Amino acid sequence: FENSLPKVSQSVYQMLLNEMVPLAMGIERQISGDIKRLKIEEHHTVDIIRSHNLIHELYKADEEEKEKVLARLRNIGFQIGLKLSELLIFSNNPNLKFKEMDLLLIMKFICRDVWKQIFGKQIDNLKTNHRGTFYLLDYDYRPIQSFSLEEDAKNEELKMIEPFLEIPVGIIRGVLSSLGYSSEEVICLASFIDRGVSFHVQ
Amino acid sequence: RSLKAMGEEIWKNKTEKINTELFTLTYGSIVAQLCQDYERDFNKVNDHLYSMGYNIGCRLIEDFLARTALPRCENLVKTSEVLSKCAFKIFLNITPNITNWSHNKDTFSLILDENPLADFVELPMDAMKSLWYSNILCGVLKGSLEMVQLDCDVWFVSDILRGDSQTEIKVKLNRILKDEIPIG
Amino acid sequence: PFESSSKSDESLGSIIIEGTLDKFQLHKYFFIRRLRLLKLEDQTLTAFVGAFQLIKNFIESISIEYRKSVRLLEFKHYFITSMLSYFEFENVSNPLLCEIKAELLMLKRDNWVQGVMATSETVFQENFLTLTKEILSLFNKCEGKRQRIVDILSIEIGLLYYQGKKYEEAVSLFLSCYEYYTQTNKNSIGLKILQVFIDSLSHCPKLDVLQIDGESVSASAVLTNAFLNILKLCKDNDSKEIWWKKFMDLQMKVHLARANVSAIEVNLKSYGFPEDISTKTMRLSLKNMGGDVIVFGASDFLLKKGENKLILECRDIMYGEFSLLSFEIIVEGITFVKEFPENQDEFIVVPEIY
Amino acid sequence: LRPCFVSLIDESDKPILIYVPNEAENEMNDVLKYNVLSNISLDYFESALVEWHSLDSKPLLKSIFQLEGVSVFAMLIKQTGLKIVIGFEQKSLSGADDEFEAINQIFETVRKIYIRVKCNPLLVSGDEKSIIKSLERKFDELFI
């Protein structure tokens, strides 16, 4: 039961997870279709922006370009979600067969194993409306503990945190479409009760 | 006490997780993004990977120095010691080897044994001759060393995925940065 | 009692198998243990079929036991151990699962008989195999499911029809079934079914086509042969496609509409020429050796259509053919509003609208 | 112990790959007599003669039928809806029980190379030819 098979650090993955978002902003704002910096390579030059200025460029982003960004985040979460679910297949969980007729039985899979694998802990609560709408909860979403809010400007800080939520949107969308189809699935906020984010699915 | 002993020692108080099934396919998924968004360009992807690598190396050097408190390096003996004997030990659970320095010891190479960034990838035929895969590592080894007051330049020579020769990275001191003291 | 008999029978069979010697007489002890298991499972709806599986694995294991060519005659004894077991499974009028069990038993008996007969009545062998395959096909068709084995059984029966000279071809007449095994998924089965249909059309010598629809045509062979040329392996069998295109040219019967997936044409930049602008030179690739057609690449304006750039003579016989495609009568005084609505149809007495 | 054909079937009627060992010489090899068993194997998943019970978490192995001197084995892996079929003849079979675990080793070591091939990041999403080509070079690495 206790498998001690090879491993790396959590911190470098968590910070790579965090810099997937300005990677997406950099790949959209620089599509190369015809203040910044400059670097020296051998007979070669690159020109970069830094991350927090690019999140501030998301604060000054166009509205249609903002949703053009957010498709890419759920696309990359979708890819890593379906491939990570495909590796979970090796685990041989006995809950499910295919097409998820009993939808909460694989909600008892994702909270038990997938969120344990990505974020080191279970999803602490799940509430069930029986029309397919299921109410996620976790008190502390793991890759936003390191995001420091500024001094008394939390209305900007909400708007600069919640575009980091499209990656687990991609995770749960990818593990659903590894098991057959696409249905609607959104985010929430759910201000926590004792000293983070909620999710809806069909 | 030794830099082998510290780098192995941090693995008793470091939070860990699986190196397959996460963290390989993160890099694979973002390089799939860069391949599909540039319509399979093979050299601009190296530039954007090196840019994101520079940013993550400049952000990672502080966690490396706060994890083990070490003095500022000055030559390519202490950097070639500290890299291969604790840095890839505590960030990737691996250890490379050092060879092919010059007569003035102003370079070395960075032969890597088990790269956990590319485990069973086997890149296709067109990308095999005009693409470097692990450019996030060359970005890290630029951006980390550029903040301990050394200008540097770190480049791949060959890797296992396209070539019979091993995975190695070449590197030049390219001078020592001068710390700016006065007011003006 | 039943579970204790099963567990004790398995343990006693292993304990009797712990003794090494007298393996030839141990067949009788295994048959006695099988009879003891069969007496316990005398009244079971589905588990008796599982007891048939307890037969069948033992019928595997006895097939693992005897290893000789003359033991094929002992497999004939296993045919008796099928047939008496068929007598142990004939105690039903009609049922869902018993029909499939009888189908599996008849398939095992037919496979054993075909293994025995092929070791060395030759005309009557086809009639007896067709009778047994017709019985097994009726038994498999008498079910709520299992259309996949029934289609392969009907294909085997039609191949047995083709195993003698027959003008009446059920598989070739079932071009719906040929497209069911050819349109997608199936290929190697389709590449033999289309070869059988083309050989039956070669030995047809008739012009009375299929009466299941309005498809009365002597170019139905060419319609199937387009799919046979698309599903061909390589240019090693290109003579079959060339001969079928030659037969379609000789027997022309000109109305057709092909998807033209066997040909690949790519365009280039628009230009001009002397007294009529010869825009849109295009390079084309093909599998057939000889092809001449008036290929015109249409183009749609905002409310018009040029439909220009046709060449009457085409001796090109290579990939990237680089057709000039001279385009007289430029519409809208050579405006730039015309987008692409390219038919690119290359009519060579039959239209291929890609 | 070596097989005579392998087969991978997804959740539809499609085959991902029908690979036989030794395509390079003819040697009286009929791909036709292999595809008919693969076509009826997807039929005999739904048959009530065999059943894959789901109480054990580990996916299990069965012995569906035996035709033309060839025995086939079909291990439905439950969750992703992939159907796999490997075939062996009687001359390769020894009839023992120790070989059954080695057969399950062959089944899991082709499932491992399937999940390693389809989790290549650089392949474009969709049923390419490159998944088939990568699968056959890995199989020819496994089977000379």
From Swiss-Prot, chain A:
The domain of life for this entry's organism is Eukaryota
Gene3D superfamilies in alphabetical order: Trafficking protein particle complex subunit 3
Q: Gene Ontology terms, cellular component aspect?
A: cis-Golgi network; cytosol; endoplasmic reticulum; phagophore assembly site; trans-Golgi network; TRAPP complex; TRAPPI protein complex; TRAPPII protein complex
- Which keywords does UniProt give here? Acetylation, Autophagy, Endoplasmic reticulum, ER-Golgi transport, Golgi apparatus, Transport
Q: Does the keyword Endoplasmic reticulum apply?
A: yes
GO biological process terms held by the UniProt record = endoplasmic reticulum to Golgi vesicle-mediated transport; intra-Golgi vesicle-mediated transport; macroautophagy; positive regulation of macroautophagy; protein localization to phagophore assembly site; protein-containing complex assembly; protein-containing complex localization; retrograde transport, endosome to Golgi
Q: Which InterPro entries match?
A: NO_sig/Golgi_transp_ligand-bd (IPR024096), TRAPP_component (IPR007194), TRAPPC6/Trs33 (IPR037992)
Specify the signal sequence span. none
User: Which compartments does it reside in?
Assistant: Golgi apparatus, cis-Golgi network; Endoplasmic reticulum; Preautophagosomal structure
Q: What does this protein do?
A: Component of the TRAPP I, TRAPP II and TRAPP III complexes which act as guanine nucleotide exchange factors (GEF) for YPT1. TRAPP I plays a key role in the late stages of endoplasmic reticulum to Golgi traffic. TRAPP II plays a role in intra-Golgi transport. TRAPP III plays a role in autophagosome formation. Required for sporulation. Has a role late in meiosis following DNA replication.
Curated annotation (Swiss-Prot), chain B:
Q: Which InterPro entries match?
A: Bet3, NO_sig/Golgi_transp_ligand-bd, TRAPP_component
Which protein, by its recorded name, is this?
Trafficking protein particle complex subunit BET3
What's this chain's function? Component of the TRAPP I, TRAPP II and TRAPP III complexes which act as guanine nucleotide exchange factors (GEF) for YPT1. TRAPP I plays a key role in the late stages of endoplasmic reticulum to Golgi traffic. TRAPP II plays a role in intra-Golgi transport. TRAPP III plays a role in autophagosome formation. Required for sporulation. Has a role late in meiosis following DNA replication.
Gene of this entry = BET3
**A Gene Ontology term for the protein's cellular component:** TRAPPIII protein complex
Q: How does it assemble?
A: Part of the multisubunit TRAPP (transport protein particle) I complex composed of BET3, BET5, TRS20, TRS23, TRS31 and TRS33. Part of the multisubunit TRAPP (transport protein particle) II complex composed of BET3, BET5, TRS20, TRS23, TRS31, TRS33, TRS65, TRS85, TRS120 and TRS130. Part of the multisubunit TRAPP (transport protein particle) III complex composed of BET3, BET5, TRS20, TRS23, TRS31, TRS33 and TRS85.
UniProt keyword list: Autophagy, Endoplasmic reticulum, ER-Golgi transport, Golgi apparatus, Lipoprotein, Palmitate, Transport
Q: Which CDD domains match?
A: TRAPPC3_bet3
Family to which this protein belongs = Belongs to the TRAPP small subunits family. BET3 subfamily.
Q: Does the keyword Transport apply?
A: yes
Q: Name one GO biological process term.
A: intra-Golgi vesicle-mediated transport
The entry's stated outcome for residue 73 to S is:
Loss of palmitoylation
Other observations noted: Present with 2370 molecules/cell in log phase SD medium.
Signal peptide range: none
Main location class: Golgi
Q: Where is the lipid attached (S-palmitoyl cysteine)?
A: 73
Swiss-Prot record, chain C:
Coiled coil where?
none
Q: Where in the cell is it found?
A: Golgi apparatus
What's in the misc comment field?
Answer: Present with 432 molecules/cell in log phase SD medium.
Job of this protein: Specific subunit of the TRAPP II complex, a highly conserved vesicle tethering complex that functions in the late Golgi as a guanine nucleotide exchange factor (GEF) for the Golgi YPT1 GTPase. TRS130 plays a role in the YPT GEF activity of TRAPP II in concert with the two other TRAPP II-specific subunits TRS65 and TRS120. Required for both the cytoplasm-to-vacuole targeting (Cvt) pathway and starvation-induced autophagy through its role in ATG8 and ATG9 trafficking.
Family stated for the protein in its record: Belongs to the TMEM1 family.
Q: How does it assemble?
A: Part of the multisubunit TRAPP (transport protein particle) II complex composed of BET3, BET5, TRS20, TRS23, TRS31, TRS33, TRS65, TRS120 and TRS130. Interacts with YPT31 and YPT32.
Which protein, by its recorded name, is this? Trafficking protein particle complex II-specific subunit 130
Q: Which organism is it from?
A: Saccharomyces cerevisiae (strain ATCC 204508 / S288c) (Baker's yeast)
Q: Which residues of the full protein are shown?
A: 252 to 652 of 1102
From Swiss-Prot, chain D:
Q: Cellular location of this protein?
A: Golgi apparatus, trans-Golgi network
Query: What are the record keywords, sorted?
Result: Golgi apparatus
Give the CC-aspect GO terms.
cytoplasm; cytosol; Golgi apparatus; nucleus; TRAPP complex; TRAPPII protein complex
Q: Which Gene3D superfamilies match?
A: 3.30.450.70
Query: What InterPro entries does the record tag this protein with?
Result: Longin-like_dom_sf (IPR011012), Sedlin (IPR006722)
Q: Describe its assembly.
A: Interacts with the TRAPP II complex; TRAPP II subunits TRS33 and TRS65 are required for this interaction.
Give the miscellaneous note. Present with 8660 molecules/cell in log phase SD medium.
For this entry, the protein name equals TRAPP-associated protein TCA17
